Amino acid sequence: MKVEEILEKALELVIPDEEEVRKGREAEEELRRRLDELGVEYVFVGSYARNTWLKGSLEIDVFLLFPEEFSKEELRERGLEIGKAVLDSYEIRYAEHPYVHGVVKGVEVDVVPCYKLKEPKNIKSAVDRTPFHHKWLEGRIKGKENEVRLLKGFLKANGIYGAEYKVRGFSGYLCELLIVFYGSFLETVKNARRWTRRTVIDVAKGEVRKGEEFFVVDPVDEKRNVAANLSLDNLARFVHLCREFMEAPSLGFFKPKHPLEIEPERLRKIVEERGTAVFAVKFRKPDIVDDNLYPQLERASRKIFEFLERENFMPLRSAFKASEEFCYLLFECQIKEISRVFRRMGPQFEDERNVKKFLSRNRAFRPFIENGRWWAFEMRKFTTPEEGVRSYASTHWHTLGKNVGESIREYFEIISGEKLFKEPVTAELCEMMGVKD
RNA sequence: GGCCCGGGGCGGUUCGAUUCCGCCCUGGGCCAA
């Protein structure tokens, strides 16, 4: 149980055993041939080509090089044609552009079309850059593949490995650049402990400096940030995670944390114990991809949080869960019920013009003076958080994201109490309240 | 689809709004795939 002792056993969870590496080779072999018999210009990229794939995430990425002069349209049509005749099973996926996804000899395969180019400039879509990235990486990551694997396992185990919007963590390309830079997993970890929210890592210049944000400059483009979508808190959890590992290394850092489910009865008690208001917003899940969905959930949650805090309900944290069935926006406030009356700041006493207007407004309670200015008692339209969120949600649906909002407008309900405990959100709430044990 | 910056119009709220809550047009930048 010192770092070395532990990393020895970690390799055993991140590195693909012989039957997984093999099964991959036979795929590539066969996948190679099919392409050759159709005489197609391709190039394997991604972690498979660079043997940097994590044990159990075997996925081959085949990019088809196309003449610079071809139209995007030709690229997809011929790409669709090629992916089609070369895949046991084929399925049309989408991202910046449409591409084919399939399976060969039992393994995942992506068949992406892109332009054959030289010089990063003239890249028309992120996918054009992929070839350069791989080109810049192949010679430099050689002999450190397992260091990359250890770093991917770590991030994966602590729920921050992907860069898609559902994670906002460290992309795979970010992982290898880090190794190229620090030489190994441990060095990366040891140095990360001194990372701040202002750290900039210029792989190309082999330098580390201070910027205006966490920035890992792409060796292939000096203006692009590889860790651009790494959220601030996710960067925080990592720095802290390295700090801990280094203080007491454990094989537990590479093992996914167990769900740790709680009986609802217990959950209720804690909420009773916390004395806070806990409720969730339930609406149907828009039939869209996670990359559009999650950023919307974040928006919705945020807009409602801010409605709650400006409306003096003292919210503590927000959260959200997504299912096949519905989406849950969760909340916790310090105020279960506020008074109807509240005070409104009026003009200063010596402004006759405004004082008069401020008084022309007939009110139920008759304003008063305090510290040189007039004030007024006013009544609220709602006195509980839920009551407030039913109002805000019913009228502000349009500001909660294009999709999420359109779904909320057509349906939603506010759940709380026991009826809430039983919904598919128990885990999220435990994280939102730091329930421990 | 989401985030950043900027223009032109509006609505509501307020003694008072460029300034708070929001809506329509609209220019550029960026992110995930």
Nearest to A65 by CA among A49, A42, A44: A42
DSSP code per residue over A371-421: TTEEEEEEE-S--SHHHHHHHHHHH-GGGS-HHHHHHHHH--EEEESHHHH
- Which method was it determined by? X-ray
Determine how many CB atoms are found less than 10 A away from the CB of residue A322.
Answer: 16
For residue A58, give the DSSP letter.
Answer: -
A158 shares a domain with A280: no
User: What is the C-alpha separation between A27 and A47, in angstroms, rounded?
Assistant: 15
A427 shares a domain with A305: yes
Please report, for the domain that includes residue A395, its CATH number: 3.30.70.590
Phi, psi of A159 (to 5 degrees): 55, 35
For tokens 């149980």, name the residue: A1
A409 shares a domain with A293: yes
Q: Is the CB of A229 under 7 A from strand B?
A: yes
Nearest to A279 by CA among A404, A434, A432, A435: A432
Copy the structure tokens of residue A100: 């084919």
User: What is the bridge-based pairing of β-strands A341-348 and A368-370?
Assistant: unpaired
Span CA (A92) to C1' (B23), Å = 38
Q: Tell me which of A126, A143, A160 is where a domain ends.
A: A143
Q: Tell me which of A348, A367, A383 is where a domain ends.
A: A383
**Residues of the domain holding A294:** 260-339+384-437
A399 shares a domain with A264: yes
Determine how many CB atoms are found less than 10 A away from the CB of residue A219.
Answer: 21
Report the b/e string of A20-59 with b at 16+ CB within 10 A: eeeebeebbeebeeebeeeebebbebbbbbbbbbbbeebe
User: What is the C-alpha separation between A424 and A324, in angstroms, rounded?
Assistant: 11
For tokens 């950023």, name the residue: A295
- How would you class A337 by CB atoms within 10 Å of its CB: exposed for 0-12, middle for 13-18, buried for 19 or more? exposed
User: What is the bridge-based pairing of β-strands A207-210 and A215-217?
Assistant: unpaired
| Nucleotide nearest to A353 in CA–C1' terms | B15
A297 shares a domain with A209: no
Span CA (A351) to C1' (B33), Å = 59
DSSP code per residue over A299-364: HHHHHHHHHHHHTT--EEEEEEEE-SSEEEEEEEES-S---SEEEEEEEETT-HHHHHHHHHS--S
User: What is the C-alpha separation between A408 and A286, in angstroms, rounded?
Assistant: 10
Q: Tell me which of A259, A290, A312 is where a domain ends.
A: A259
Domain count, chain A: 4
Span CA (A303) to C1' (B24), Å = 20
Span CA (A399) to C1' (B7), Å = 21
For residue A257, give the DSSP letter.
Answer: P
* Close Cβ partners of A181 (under 8 Å, ≥ 6 residues apart): A188, A201, A203, A206
Nearest to A149 by CA among A188, A193, A91, A114: A188
Q: Is the CB of A197 under 7 A from strand B?
A: no
A354 shares a domain with A335: no
A249 shares a domain with A174: yes
For tokens 């660079």, name the residue: A50
Is the C-alpha dihedral spanning A82, A84, A88, A92 positive or negative?
positive
A120 shares a domain with A76: yes
A236 shares a domain with A163: yes
Amino acid identity at A316: L
Q: Is the CB of A215 under 7 A from strand B?
A: no
Is the C-alpha dihedral spanning A123, A124, A129, A130 positive or negative?
negative
For tokens 């201070």, name the residue: A210
Phi, psi of A377 (to 5 degrees): -90, 140
Q: Is the CB of A359 under 7 A from strand B?
A: no
Q: Is the CB of A96 under 7 A from strand B?
A: yes
Torsion-angle region of residue A119: left (phi > 0), alpha (psi -120 to 50) or beta? left
A156 shares a domain with A89: no
DSSP code per residue over A10-57: HHHHHS--HHHHHHHHHHHHHHHHHHHHTT--EEEEHHHHTT---TT-
A295 shares a domain with A221: no
- How would you class A102 by CB atoms within 10 Å of its CB: exposed for 0-12, middle for 13-18, buried for 19 or more? buried
Task: Give strand B nucleotides closer than 7 A to any protein Cβ.
Answer: 1-3, 14-16, 20-24, 30-33
**Apex CA A154: angle with CA A247 and CA A233, to 5°?**
80
Distances (CA, A) of A331 to A31, A263, A317, A335: 50, 20, 6, 12
Copy the structure tokens of residue A65: 């090089």
Distances (CA, A) of A117 to A67, A69, A114, A227: 8, 10, 9, 25
User: What is the C-alpha separation between A412 and A430, in angstroms, rounded?
Assistant: 23
Say what the resolution is, in angstroms: 2.8
